[PDB]
Amino acid sequence: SNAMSDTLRPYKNLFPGIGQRVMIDTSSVVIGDVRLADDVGIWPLVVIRGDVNYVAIGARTNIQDGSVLHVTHKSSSNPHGNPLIIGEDVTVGHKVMLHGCTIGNRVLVGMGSIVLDGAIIEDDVMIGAGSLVPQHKRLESGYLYLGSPVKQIRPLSDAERSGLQYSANNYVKWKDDYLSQDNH
Ligand SMILES: [Zn+2]
Numbered sequence: 314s315n316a317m318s319d320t321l322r323p324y325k326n327l328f329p330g331i332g333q334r335v336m337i338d339t340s341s342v343v344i345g346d347v348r349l350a351d352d353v354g355i356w357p358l359v360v361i362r363g364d365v366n367y368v369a370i371g372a373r374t375n376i377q378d379g380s381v382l383h384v385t386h387k388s389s390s391n392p393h394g395n396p397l398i399i400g401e402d403v404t405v406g407h408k409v410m411l412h413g414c415t416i417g418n419r420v421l422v423g424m425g426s427i428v429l430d431g432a433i434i435e436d437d438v439m440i441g442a443g444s445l446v447p448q449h450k451r452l453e454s455g456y457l458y459l460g461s462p463v464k465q466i467r468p469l470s471d472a473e474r475s476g477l478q479y480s481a482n483n484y485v486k487w488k489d490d491y492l493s494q495d496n497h
Contacts, residue, residue, distance in 0.1 A: 324364035332372070336488040350374070350401070354488030366394040371401035371418065375484035379408040385430050395430040402481035406442065414446070417454070419477040427461075437474055441466075 314322075320337055321329045324345035332351040337343055341355050345363040350372040355361065357378045361368055366384035376382065385395035395413025399405070403416055406424035413430030416422070420434050423442035428434070431449040438452050441459030452458050455474070457466045469477075 327363065334489070334492065336492055352485050354484055366396040366413070368397040370399045371403065373401055373481050373485050374399055374403040374405070375481070375488070376405045377407040377409070380405055380411070382411045385413045400436070402478060404480040404484060419481065421477055421480055437469065437477060439469060439473060439477065
């Protein structure tokens with residue numbers, strides 16, 4: 314709002330719920346019903362707005378710089394609305410737009426991509442930079458998708474599959490580097 318300048322902010326009676334060893338950059342804006350599990354890192358200049366619906370982010374997931382995360386409101390034609398559900402060990406790349414979608418575990422969303430409402434990204438998926446995942450699109454586990462709108466390109470190589478976990482692991486280490494700077 315116009316006077317509220319906190320990093321963590323209310324919407325009506327909703328307020329973020331934060332686990333352990335969570336980094337939320339001071340320059341970022343986290344509003345309302347945003348549930349951040351252990352070891353989540355929210356990098357600079359990110360907005361996560363869980364006002365008209367909730368946002369749930371699983372453990373050891375990074376939301377990289379410049380991303381915006383939002384949701385669709387609840388109404389008669391859509392009583393549930395579209396909340397934003399993100400699993401564990403997920404890498405949300407820089408400048409990603411996530412809106413009302415579901416992302417499983419060990420997914421890398423390439424920088425500059427857009428994922429729209431009702432999309433469902435299964436576990437162990439990579440999305441190339443600059444992609445667009447349309448509303449209600451399901452992305453099958455174990456594949457590379459890229460394009461606007463995305464096409465299924467090929468199965469992930471075994472190295473790429475492992476790389477999904479490596480990315481999440483690296484980002485937990487890196488957020489811990491920043492947190493260690495705070496504690497000193
Ligand atoms: Zn929106």
